[PDB]
Design an enzyme around this catalytic site. Sequence first.
Site, PDB file in Angstrom:
ATOM      1  N   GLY A  47      61.290  -2.998 120.632  1.00 17.23           N
ATOM      2  CA  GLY A  47      60.893  -4.330 120.093  1.00 17.23           C
ATOM      3  C   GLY A  47      61.860  -5.061 120.413  1.00 17.23           C
ATOM      4  N   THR A  65      64.163 -11.396 117.019  1.00 15.86           N
ATOM      5  CA  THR A  65      65.262 -12.449 115.988  1.00 15.86           C
ATOM      6  C   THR A  65      66.282 -11.278 115.109  1.00 15.86           C
ATOM      7  OG1 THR A  65      63.504 -14.384 115.141  1.00 15.86           O
ATOM      8  CG2 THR A  65      65.658 -14.041 114.439  1.00 15.86           C
ATOM      9  N   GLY A  69      67.292  -8.265 116.777  1.00 17.05           N
ATOM     10  CA  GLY A  69      67.880  -8.173 117.433  1.00 17.05           C
ATOM     11  C   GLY A  69      66.698  -7.207 118.804  1.00 17.05           C
ATOM     12  N   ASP A  85      60.595 -11.835 102.887  1.00 22.87           N
ATOM     13  CA  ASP A  85      60.300 -11.206 104.297  1.00 22.87           C
ATOM     14  C   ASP A  85      59.069 -10.389 104.586  1.00 22.87           C
ATOM     15  OD1 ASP A  85      59.477 -13.148 106.561  1.00 22.87           O
ATOM     16  OD2 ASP A  85      60.718 -11.849 107.633  1.00 22.87           O
TER      17      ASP A  85
END
Lengths: 267, 343
Positions: free
Chosen positions: B28, B31, B33, B144
């Site tokens: 992956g 945002t 990293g 989130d």
Amino acid sequence: DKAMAGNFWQSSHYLQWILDKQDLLKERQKDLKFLSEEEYWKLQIFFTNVIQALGEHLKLRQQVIATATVYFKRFYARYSLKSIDPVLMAPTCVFLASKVEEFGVVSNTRLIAAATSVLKTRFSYAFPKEFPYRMNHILECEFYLLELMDCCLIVYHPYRPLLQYVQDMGQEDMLLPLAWRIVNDTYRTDLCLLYPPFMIALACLHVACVVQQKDARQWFAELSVDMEKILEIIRVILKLYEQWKNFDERKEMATILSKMPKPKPPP
Amino acid sequence: MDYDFKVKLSSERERVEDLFEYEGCKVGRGTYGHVYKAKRKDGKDDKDYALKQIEGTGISMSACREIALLRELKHPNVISLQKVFLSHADRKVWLLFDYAEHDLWHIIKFHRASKLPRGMVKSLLYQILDGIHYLHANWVLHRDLKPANILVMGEGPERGRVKIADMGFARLFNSPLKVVTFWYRAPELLLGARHYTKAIDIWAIGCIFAELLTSEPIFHCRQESNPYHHDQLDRIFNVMGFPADKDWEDIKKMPEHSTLMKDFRRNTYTNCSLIKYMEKHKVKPDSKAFHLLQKLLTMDPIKRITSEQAMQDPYFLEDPLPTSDVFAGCQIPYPKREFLTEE
Ligand SMILES: Cc1ncc2sc(C(=O)N3CCC[C@H]3c3ccc(Cl)cc3)nn12
């Protein structure tokens, strides 16, 4: 910041950073070749005061300042004063502590400006030259600090339990201002490395009650706590006030700082 | 800095590139990293690890708070920080985790692409609630929560265990105001709530639960400063109906209430309800599943159930009971993560 508030008994603070007094004193002997035990304590007091002034200038809450103070103590509980300059470490500890909190950030120029201004205006008795470090030194030092604390960042302090105890007494106006100030004073000792914060809080509250002639014997009796340990903490607080009386920080620190072992350069 | 101190620490420092094989094994990039599937170079164990190089350099607020909280948090349904590596040369932070092959985003897509044992959905919900409850009891908000951040372990000793990840650790002043989707955002956020709360996490869990039941995001709408998002609110009302005064008395205290009144009329949504929505997606409104869902997706955040109360719901006492392995010992049909080779 209320994060992890009821988790002390499973915390990194409790499980790794409540140290054995004899282990602490054993590690300290390396620096006692250069400084007396009294001089080392005076040095601890001095840098506590430096960190407090840095935090006040930066307008940080007392809990952030206290966290920065414990980072500093933890570092030098383990390593020598010569390893990294404490003049560099103190602002670094404040910088890192500020980032563990969420309400506002300390910028790079603001940290360096604070370090320069605070040392010049409040500590010229100790320091003849201006703050020589730039932000790249802080950032480098921060990596060492974080690593060498084993990334332990959440620190518990006596302020929160003290507030609960004084509320429980029903003596907020009477005892809280004095007891809080005595909590601040405990950071001029090793107590935060040795005792759970609630024990330190109770000891500070006890001394506040004695100073103000408040009878709280029955309330202190109603606690399920090892009172022998509370008395140990009280004795250190009483000892700090006698040292304070006999210590002239402003007259002595330049001499004590010159006796400190200093970082050896490369060959 | 003392030279002997420096060289000693440099000699002793564990370096991520020396300890782990992860070259070409990136799973992956975002945002957060870079995340790699990693394996130890010495064969001490045969486990798969996840290695995250945090976005940016130095110690950011996100990194600082991620490290600070994960260093303390210990729960089966919250991802465990195994190690932190600090790379001094390039000022990079690396975090080590146990590798999670799966997550809810990919599980949901796999099911959606088809157009699941009996208690898989229920077991997932319970473990999500268990993990979030543990955070909440420690005064930690996720802030989130979404299918992409709810990991599930693949084959190994933690088979089918949920791991909550990517906790959104740094939000200045605990404030939501300081390619984006708003599908999991509570309506109070959309009406300008100044702070994140426990209730905001609970709404997101409700959204996830609806999505697990139907394989479709319940408040789906177009993607993409101002917290007020018209189409997202429109979608919520098309699903839930428009709240009466009695449903959400403190809606008037929301900063964007007057904007809501300017843009929306109650009558537009008169025949809309969660009951009707879920009926269309073959979920029975008299089911215990539904009644719990409705309690999680309450519009007024003060009327939303807590994670504790959700875990106590009789839904979880009804056959089939939740299981520690959400796959229930059945063979996992979901494919493994592919490695990213894009520059
Ligand atoms: C696969 C994995 N196993 C353990 C762990 S932590 C971890 C992570 O940092 N994050 C941040 C965003 C959500 C999660 C993640 C999930 C999937 C992928 Cl492809 C990349 C990252 N990912 N991950």
